Amino acid sequence: LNNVVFTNKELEDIYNLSNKEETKEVLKLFKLKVNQFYRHAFGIVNDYNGLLEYKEIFNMMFLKLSVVFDTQRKEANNVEQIKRNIAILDEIMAKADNDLSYFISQNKNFQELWDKAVKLTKEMKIKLKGQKLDLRDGEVAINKVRELFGSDKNVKELWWFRSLLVKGVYLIKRYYEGDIELATTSDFAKAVFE
């Protein structure tokens, strides 16, 4: 439910203020950075949504940007300041990347799991070659991984823990839909209800 990100309308309004003629070829560069910025920001939101701290990082990016827009809004023709603002946007993205790394490296096995996902993906190139796979769902996608690497230590742990979790939310759902007697539906349910 984004509201922290400026609409293309709002961005165009801000670009306008840079009406003078000298502040024109710099305004070209500024417009380019703001785009690289958006790309960089959303890249984070759909390449790192698995990282808890991704929302924080995304938001800081736009909070810091809004500040730069404040400057621009009341100095839209100050080319030397626009040049600096362009540098600040670069500084903002550089910190977002730093944050991204700090967290990924602070989460024990996050680096290892990343490499593994990279390694198995490369292998998927081979395995899927002309397999004409075509289905939408994290399910189908994840089932494929199981189907191809069921013997891998990491996808094994993921599939096992996953199966239990899913089983756990389905039964509690049943429980609250009036049921019980569930305490003897499986060893899992028995341990969950005892």
Place this chain on the structure above:
Amino acid sequence: QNLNNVVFTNKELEDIYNLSNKEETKEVLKLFKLKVNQFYRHAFGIVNDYNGLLEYKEIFNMMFLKLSVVFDTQRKEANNVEQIKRNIAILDEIMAKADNDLSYFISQNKNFQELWDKAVKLTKEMKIKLKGQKLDLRDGEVAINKVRELFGSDKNVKELWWFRSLLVKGVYLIKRYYEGDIELATTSDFAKAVFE
């Protein structure tokens, strides 16, 4: 998911029970009938309480393979009480091995016990968290999304969500790749590393 033409229908089971028509082989036939039930219970218990374990299908099938053999004996000895008694003992031995196998594997896979406990622990907690939340959606997606939404901070669901997100991204881009695309090598740091 192994659970097909290896398991005898209740029709087939009834046919086999019939052969035990004599009258002495009747009170034993009651016990045999009981064991075969406990057996099915035990077997399917494995298929819906351990499907997360790769080797579950193997175990399930061994159980019915070994069972089929006991049925062969019963079929041509349906009135041999002392044999029936032994068969009942064999079914007990079959279940005992299935349990052995289930343990062997689970302990050969390191963190499986830990993850099981954790899933149990978090589920217990879901009882409290979900109380009157009227959750009602089908999909492993929705189900797992909920777990992330409730325990996003847990060490284990954290690793699962991270590794999961990358794997899914990896299978989707390779799919794109094979649908004629490329230029993908610069769509993300992940794709770059995948294609370099």
